[PDB]
């Protein structure tokens, strides 16, 4: 039948792709960086403990100034903090308390959030009356909102449990592009430094590179064994790292079109909830279900430090654009700044 | 100057802290419930008796606030979004007395999930009347789908309703002991299961939830003092 031919032909192309990737693998990253000096023990300390949310935290996002940040809690509240002083600036009540993601517009004028309501809500922080009111409600997803990131003040890319990603035109309420091809819930997305491309991780154990303007998947990366929960671009935009429920983080090269390194340990048995790079990319930070965060030497795959200050599972983390600090959120309802 | 900026930031923080204090009063004084269905269970009719992905229904029992949430427009794959409800007072699981076996696998997943281990489950074995007529007719049997029914006997702790024939009493009690086997196998004092033989229209449903929640909160209090 034609179904077998299409299934048979697809298997033929997968073998071809695997052969091409196998030909490019003449030397591993580990042996290329074998002669470089180790990073050494890096010890970080909790410099700030942000309190005030009533329930578990699900997402946080640094502002482009490296000082302000927004946090989303399932109590139905969005809080914008000033990390330097610990003072709270905005407490935005939410129509639905089941929020799962939040984003800080790069201009600092808007913040977004979504969740089980399947709606992406944008809030105008600079309203003429000083109060924070919902500006636009983006509907059209048939599943919960998992992640979102502003491209500019009028464009935002989202990921949904409906297995698709969408690009929206704010102030019209319509999505101008739909990124289909994932089979499981899309869990995280990351914008490239140039914003021309972005990568998404789904519950099908695969990550996809997308073309924002054209709207098609350019590459697909495999190697993880379970759901991908977090994804982050390498600083130069030629690689990215992912965290999975299989208790491992992996580094993928865009030009080599294959995996380069696996960060794992025998004592690490829980899933990874978040991932982020340092300013230079030498360090890879990952949050874990076991309440801890591990610092990895990206070049040598060695573990260099641990952040252990949370009493419940770490749900999100991020590194300031200046690279001066890293923030971690937990279901324990607290946010911590490490330096 | 800067001292004026810091003063303004403290006043802004102070005002927000005031609203959050009152916000914490309402949140702590309201019990959140997740309404879950195994399919055609009749929970919609029960809800009628008191893109949108979540539905809400608020009701009051003896001056006590209750907040119940029903999932809509969400895919059948629950392993991700189910984690959101790890802190609700209880999960209401409505089941129509091989959908029954399917409902059993979903209950076992919920009962044994690492995030949901401390969460209690109120179980509504719904549509007792429908099971009665089917049992009485005998055209369909539970033996085909559950061979252990042949060797099952009505429990000595059974309290059949007045006028209930022995055949229907065994059927509904056999189904109840299917869920109880899963619940007792695990959950070492962390969470509990409350079965109920219910009809989709009986007015006593909201009273049952109120009584089950009170026991759950009582047990939580006793466990914080290490008494139970």
């Amino acid at each position, epitope marked *: 039948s034609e179904l077998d031919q299409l299934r048979q032909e697809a298997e033929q192309l997968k073998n071809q792709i695997r052969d091409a990737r196998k030909a490019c693998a003449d030397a591993t990253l580990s042996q290329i960086t074998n002669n470089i000096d180790p990073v050494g023990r890096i010890q970080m300390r909790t410099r700030r403990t942000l309190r005030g949310h009533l329930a578990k935290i699900y997402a946080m996002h640094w502002g482009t100034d490296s000082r302000l940040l927004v946090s989303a809690s399932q109590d139905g509240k969005l809080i914008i903090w000033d990390s330097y002083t610990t003072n709270k600036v905005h407490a935005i009540p939410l129509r639905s308390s089941w929020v799962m993601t939040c984003a800080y517009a790069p201009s600092g004028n808007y913040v977004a959030c979504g969740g089980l309501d399947n709606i992406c809500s944008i809030y105008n922080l600079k309203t003429r009356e000083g109060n924070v009111r919902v500006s636009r409600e983006l509907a059209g997803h048939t599943g919960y909102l998992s992640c979102c990131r502003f491209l500019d003040d009028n464009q935002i890319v989202t990921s949904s449990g409906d297995t698709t990603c969408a690009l929206w035109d704010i102030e019209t309420g319509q999505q101008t592009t739909t990124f289909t091809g994932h*089979t*499981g819930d899309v869990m995280s997305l990351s914008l490239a430094p140039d914003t021309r491309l972005f990568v998404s991780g789904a519950c099908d154990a695969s990550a996809k590179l997308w073309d924002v303007r054209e709207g098609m998947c350019r590459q697909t990366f*495999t190697g993880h*064994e379970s*759901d991908i929960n977090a994804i982050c671009f390498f600083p130069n935009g030629n690689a990215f790292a992912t965290g999975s429920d299989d208790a491992t983080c992996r580094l993928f090269d865009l030009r080599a079109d294959q995996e380069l390194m696996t960060y794992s340990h025998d004592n690490i048995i829980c899933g990874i909830t978040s991932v982020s790079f340092s300013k230079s990319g030498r360090l890879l930070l990952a949050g874990y279900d076991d309440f801890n965060c591990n610092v990895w030497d990206a070049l040598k795959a060695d573990r260099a430090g641990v952040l252990a200050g949370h009493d419940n599972r770490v749900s999100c983390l991020g590194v300031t654009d200046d690279g001066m600090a890293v923030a971690t959120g937990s279901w324990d309802s607290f946010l911590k700044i490490w330096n | 100057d800067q001292r004026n900026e810091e003063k303004a930031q403290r006043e802004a923080n102070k005002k927000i802290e005031k609203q959050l204090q009152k916000d914490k009063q309402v949140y702590r004084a309201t019990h959140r419930l997740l309404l879950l269905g195994a399919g055609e269970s009749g929970k919609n009719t029960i809800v009628k008796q008191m893109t949108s992905g979540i539905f809400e229904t608020k009701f009051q029992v003896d001056k006590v606030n209750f907040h119940m949430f029903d999932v809509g427009a969400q895919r059948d794959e629950r392993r991700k979004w189910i984690q959101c409800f790890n802190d609700v007072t209880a999960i209401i699981f409505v089941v129509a007395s*091989n959908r029954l*076996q399917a409902a059993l696998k979903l209950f076992d997943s919920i009962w044994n999930n690492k995030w949901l281990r401390d969460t209690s489950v109120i179980l509504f074995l719904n549509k007792q009347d429908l099971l009665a007529e089917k049992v009485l007719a005998g055209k369909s049997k539970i033996e085909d789908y559950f*061979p252990e029914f042949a060797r099952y006997t009505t429990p000595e702790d059974a309290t059949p309703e007045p006028g209930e024939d022995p055949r229907v009493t065994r059927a509904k009690y056999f189904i109840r002991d299917e869920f109880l086997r899963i619940s007792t196998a695990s959950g070492d004092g962390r969470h509990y299961c409350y079965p109920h033989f219910t009809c989709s229209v009986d007015t006593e449903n909201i009273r049952r939830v109120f009584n089950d929640c009170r026991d759950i909160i009582q047990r939580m209090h006793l466990r914080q003092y290490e008494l139970l």
Partner: nanobody
Amino acid sequence: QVQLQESGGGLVQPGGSLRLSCAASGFTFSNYKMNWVRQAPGKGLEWVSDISQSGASISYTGSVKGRFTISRDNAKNTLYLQMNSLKPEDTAVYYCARCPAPFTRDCFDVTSTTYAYRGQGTQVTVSS
């Protein structure tokens, strides 16, 4: 790449038997729970059986409790289902399904209409 490829099955007379196999690759086979599911013509997906990581814990659906037998060989990354006394109601497509996460006690979504960690099932037809 996570891959599951079921083999075996086909036309069998009533009262016969079959031996289904599932070849797994792309993941550590020894730390995942496994399941067999089937989809009868004009019906939804139905759970059949499952086996723990070490094979100690086994369970079956009522209709096949004494007839089917599930086994696994961790060293070879293969899953088995021995089907005996097959009757016409058993005709369906049988899929080899892996639980979503390793080292886990629960097993969610294995019977959903679309599930990533499931192979392309093998047709099993019981007829005269």
